[PDB]
């Protein structure tokens, strides 16, 4: 036979304090390395900004494709550089597509997809220069401006999603909480 | 922007009158020839480590630093410039809010004084003027400055002492663990600082060219790489001045693992081989060998009472002795290895008594030494097991090895 | 394809269920107010280390556990997506047949369980529930997913147990050293598998696109590379949260040195100087000199 | 003292050394393969290697190099080994009390002398 | 047999720093010659330690005789070829330690802790 010998614990209230420790730490972890994403984010306001003119530079650009076998082949395709107006403070501004298009190169408002083929490459920009000359001036659309770092740059597109910020953040917000309910649900089971 | 000079002078400033004035105080005998007790006390009534009050502040500057140490390490992670206007790390309340306090509690740390000099060469005292001053002259400039606000992480040393006062850890060993962790915690902290300090603007003979653009965080992970002796090179100081200290930091490190390792490190490597109860086996019977622990005796009583040949019967064996198990386990172990556990504590105190459930217990078995020089004495001691094992749980079965015919009359 | 976060949510859900509910049925004293001995003895007769059919099929769980890393050796080393349709590792039949087994052994584990909460809170135990869901969704979505299953690698922890129930071998520190062995290369067969996970897919803050094309062979190389300290730096952690667990394993290795070398390994390098017999000495006669050698 | 001023002494003796043997190139290549480094990059580059840190941001690229370097490590080791459990150990334990019971104002004092158990 | 040994090694050292593939014919390490030399010694000497063996199969399973099958025989196929192989011979440098004994008997070294170093 046995007595309160029967509880025994030791492998609950230990883990509810590992639970709440790994979920306090990964959030205060997590807090100290998105801020630098988040702040580039918020740095960026919405603004209606105009197509003001699109030219053809005409410089050639080369960009590296692969056919997921470890391919190292180079590609030229022609720079498109669009400089557009922003409608609050009335700017001429150089377009780009997205972050990842700007830093690896700022010359060219837009990079199409690096093709196997430089006919078609040529293709796809004059596809994709026919679908910016049409909307050009008039019709505002939404649109990213940033004012303080780099004024004379536009986006079309956002540097980050909060989806993948939030979906990262509440697993240890929810990890503390399992922590805090095992820690207390064995004291509320240590009474009797 | 070159004012940032004046934020470093600020501090050497207060420090230079700071050791200059306490001590031409205390010169001259003759004063001039040809309330201060009061407020000393109101100081020091709280500054006790044992009072209340002090126990509790003492936990607030300790906060306080781990939040200036956060919001430092914020802050250390953005670029050189940035538009410091609509959102500077909640703004010039949070850069003075720590320090409001902090500079408060050098002014109480310096009338709770008690041996004025000392006070200020207190290694303690010295880190808060270096702290306190670089943030007077941010708010000033309303531009913030990354400063030597790492050395705030030097209040770390304090973590033993806390978890002593709030109880939360009661061993020797585990305060000697957490003072150790703690002391090296802080260091690494303080030394990967000063490297990343010292690589965030370039050489001065290369008029500041020559600068490394890396984080506190792969400045803190290279020096853990390097006091390891991984060293793998993927980033190091490029800096003739980083290098100048990368070389100090290498042998102070050595000089700590010298000084630390045989002394206090290796006490703690070695600790109890054995501690807690018998206890998470339901349901069955318990019995504790108490007395004589020695390789024979147990050797033909475990052989006997679990021979297998009993057929409807538990294992039980606790185990109890003062001078622990160290051959017993090379020379038998206890003949099973998931079962039959051994307490290393002794059979008179409660307390161990306690450990082993005594109460829950079907039967103590007392074991004599047959070789003892003294059977007399050895009876005695077993006739004083069975009266503390009787005093602690007077409704138990005992049996017991007596050497001599006459003693047994004493256990009536 | 975005479904592999379902594969890692089905092993964190039943380990939720299994900390909330056994722990929630062990409180109110008072029930209400205002066959289970039978099947709890069928399912503990055979889990006996001592019993014949315990020790055989701990000599099952462990055989089973080496196959489930053996084949994850094998998908661990492709590329991050193949056309997986005729022939996908010997197909959803061997995906499935260990973990059909370890289920059943986690059921029986859990019907044989003597004191409830505790058999869930046994390290040996919390791996079960990691391993053996992420696959049931791979075998449910009939396509591949590199999950978390090298844990399985900490069954390796009896194999000094099993070594001394099959009889192979019988010195105490030669058990030691092969307790020691086993304990070591399950941690940095672990520790190895994190990092090359960690290391698969990119770090958040860059979109994944920092990601390190390297094999499992390349990282379990840097983690030994790394722990005795050599440390090449021709392959490394390129990740933050590669670096942030690198310094996690580093300190991990430190301190299992610091608490292991000075209290079992110095007693396994220091053994007997002299044993066995005089024997490999053809023809000649022997003596020996009994009684006060000095 | 003397431990590490004999230390100090055979760092920048090797080091001077290695200095001199990377400032003029190998034999073989007609003197080409030099490396132009200081001094102070020299001595910096033994001691993270006697240390075994051992970055491999600097290392010597010549033959005489690192003929000289694998006999420096292998002197550095054999110097750790004939130094540390003899000389080093006992200097690091040292004794554990010591000096006056003073920094304490305006108290009385005793002591206890004798028996301390 | 441990000069030869050593022999064996200073040639070994010699080719394994060539080429993977050189004309060898007019300059080849001093020929075929010196090629079978060590080992028709070394052959003789397998054969009296075989004759020789007093416990015939512990003979063949002494690590000092495993090494002789090793290194002997790829030499005796590189002269029937007339062509040099890169082989196993550096499994040669395993007579080595034999070096203590043979300071021992020689008396060079008299200390127990000497011999043991
Ligand atoms: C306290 C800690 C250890 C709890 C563990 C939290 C883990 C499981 C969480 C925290 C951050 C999370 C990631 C954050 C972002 C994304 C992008 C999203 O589109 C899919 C899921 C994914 C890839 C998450 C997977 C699970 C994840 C790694
Ligand atoms: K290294």
């Known amino acids: ?192 | 922007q070159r004012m940032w000079w004046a934020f470093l002078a600020s501090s050497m400033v207060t420090f230079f009158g700071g050791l200059f004035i306490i001590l031409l105080w205390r010169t001259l005998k003759y004063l001039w020839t040809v309330w201060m007790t009061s407020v000393k006390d109101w100081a020091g009534v709280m500054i006790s480590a044992q009072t209340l009050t002090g126990r509790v502040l003492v936990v607030l500057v300790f906060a306080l630093s781990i939040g200036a140490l956060v919001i430092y390490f914020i802050d250390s992670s953005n670029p050189i410039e940035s538009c410091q206007n609509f959102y500077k790390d909640f703004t010039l309340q949070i850069d003075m809010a720590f320090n409001v306090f902090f500079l408060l509690y050098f002014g109480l740390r310096f009338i709770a004084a008690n041996d004025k000099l000392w006070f200020w060469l207190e290694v303690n005292s010295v880190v808060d003027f270096f702290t306190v001053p670089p943030v007077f002259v941010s708010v000033y400039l309303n531009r913030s400055w990354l400063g030597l606000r790492f050395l705030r992480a030097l209040r770390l040393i304090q973590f033993s002492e806390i978890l002593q006062f709030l109880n939360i850890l009661k061993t020797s060993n585990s305060i000697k663990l957490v003072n150790l962790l703690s002391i090296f915690i802080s260091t690494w902290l303080t030394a990967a600082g000063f490297i990343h300090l010292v690589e965030n603007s370039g050489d001065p003979w290369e008029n500041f060219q020559n600068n490394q653009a890396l984080t506190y965080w792969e400045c803190v992970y290279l020096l853990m790489v390097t006091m390891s002796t991984v060293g793998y090179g993927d980033v190091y100081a490029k800096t003739t001045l980083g290098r100048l200290f990368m070389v100090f930091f290498i042998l102070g490190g050595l000089a700590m693992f010298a000084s630390y390792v045989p002394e206090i490190i290796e006490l703690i490597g070695n600790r109890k081989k054995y501690g807690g109860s018998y206890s998470a086996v339901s349901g069955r019977k318990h019995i504790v060998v108490c007395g004589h622990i020695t390789l024979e005796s147990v050797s033909n009583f475990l052989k006997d009472f679990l021979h297998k040949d009993r057929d409807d019967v538990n294992v039980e064996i606790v185990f109890l002795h003062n001078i622990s198990p160290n051959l017993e386990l090379e020379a038998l172990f206890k003949r099973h290895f998931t079962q039959v556990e051994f307490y290393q504590g002794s059979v008179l105190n409660p307390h161990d008594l306690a450990r082993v459930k005594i109460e829950s217990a079907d039967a103590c078995l007392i074991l004599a030494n047959k070789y003892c020089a003294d059977p007399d004495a050895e009876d005695a001691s077993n006739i004083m097991r069975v009266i503390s094992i009787k005093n602690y749980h007077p409704k138990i079965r005992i049996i017991t090895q007596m050497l001599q015919y006459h003693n047994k009359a004493h256990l009536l």
């Not at chain 1, 590296?64 to 409608?87: E, K």
């Not at chain 1, 000359?133 to 770092?149: L, R």
């Not at chain 1, 309910?181 to 009474?191: D, Y």
């Open chain 1, 1 to 192: 036979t046995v007595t309160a010998l029967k509880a025994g614990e030791d492998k609950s209230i230990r883990l509810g304090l590992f639970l709440i420790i790994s979920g306090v730490v990964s959030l205060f972890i997590f807090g100290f390395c998105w801020l630098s994403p988040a702040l580039q984010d918020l740095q960026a306001t919405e603004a209606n900004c105009t197509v003001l003119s699109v030219q053809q530079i005409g410089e050639v650009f080369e960009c590296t494709f692969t056919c997921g076998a470890d391919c190292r082949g180079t590609s030229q395709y022609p720079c498109v550089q669009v400089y557009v107006n922003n409608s609050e403070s009335n700017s001429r501004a150089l377009l780009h597509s997205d972050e990842h298009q700007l830093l690896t190169n700022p010359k060219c408002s837009y990079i199409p997809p690096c093709k196997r083929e430089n006919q078609k490459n040529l293709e796809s920009v004059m596809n994709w220069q026919q679908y910016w000359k049409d909307e050009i001036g008039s019709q505002p659309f939404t649109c990213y401006f940033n004012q303080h770092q780099r004024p004379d740059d536009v986006l079309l597109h956002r540097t980050h999603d909060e989806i993948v910020l939030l979906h990262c953040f509440l697993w240890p917000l929810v990890t503390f909480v399992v922590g805090v309910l095992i820690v207390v649900l064995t004291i509320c089971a240590k009474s009797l």
